Structures are given as structure tokens and as C-alpha cells.
Amino acid sequence: MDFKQEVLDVLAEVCQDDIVKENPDIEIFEEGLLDSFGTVELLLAIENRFDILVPITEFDRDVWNTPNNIVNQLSELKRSHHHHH
Ligand SMILES: *O=P([O])([O])O[C]C([C])([C])[C]([O])C(=O)[N][C][C]C(=O)[N][C][C][S]
Ligand SMILES: [Mg+2]
Numbered sequence: 001m002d003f004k005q006e007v008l009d010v011l012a013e014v015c016q017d018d019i020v021k022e023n024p025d026i027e028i029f030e031e032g033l034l035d036s037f038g039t040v041e042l043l044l045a046i047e048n049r050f051d052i053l054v055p056i057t058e059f060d061r062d063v064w065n066t067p068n069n070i071v072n073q074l075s076e077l078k079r080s081h082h083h084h085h
């Protein structure tokens with residue numbers, strides 16, 4: 001699957017709302033689609049699905065504020081934050 005699409009798939013599942021696909025510029029936190037619990041769930045799901053570890057200390061609601069921006073952040077971090085054998 002396309003990386004962006006697979007990320008949006010995970011996000012939609014954690015948010016339990018496909019709106020994150022329909023409008024990838026929706027303000028996730030301003031619209032209450034995700035809370036702190038959901039943020040942890042999301043980061044854990046990302047590591048499980050992609051083996052990309054995003055430390056909670058790196059997450060910023062202002063930077064990871066829309067589906068598009070989350071996809072973009074993960075894209076930037078993918079290489080350096082992937083587990084190493
Ligand atoms: O990290 P946040 O989402 O901003 O935390 C919000 C808090 C501070 C209000 C937090 O205590 C909280 O979410 N309480 C509700 C119970 C819960 O879900 N705790 C786990 C937070 S990841
Ligand atoms: Mg937080």
C-alpha cells in the first residue's frame with residue numbers, strides 16, 4: 001500500500017472516523033478527533049505497523065495537527081526513526 005494511504009488508514013482507525021481521509025487538512029485536535037490517549041495509541045500503532053518509533057517527547061499538537069501534517073512528519077522521520085537490526 002502507498003505509505004501515505006497506509007498512514008491515513010492507521011489514523012482513521014485510531015480516530016475511528018474516516019473523515020481524516022476525506023479531509024486530510026482537518027484540524028485533528030481542534031475537532032476533538034484525537035486526545036492524549038489517542039496520541040499514545042497512534043504512536044504505538046505507527047511503531048507496530050511501520051517499525052517507526054516516534055518518542056512521545058517529539059510529538060507536538062501544533063506540528064502534528066492534521067492528517068497531511070502527520071503523514072509529512074512520519075515521512076521525514078521514517079529513515080532515522082526506524083528500528084535498526
Ligand atoms: O497528554 P494529554 O492528552 O494532553 O493529557 C491530557 C490530560 C492531562 C488531561 C490527561 O491527564 C488525560 O488524558 N486524562 C484522561 C485519562 C487518560 O486518557 N489518560 C491517559 C493520557 S495519555
Ligand atoms: Mg501529548
Ligand SMILES: [Mg+2]
Nearest residue numbers: 055056057058
Ligand atoms: Mg525527543
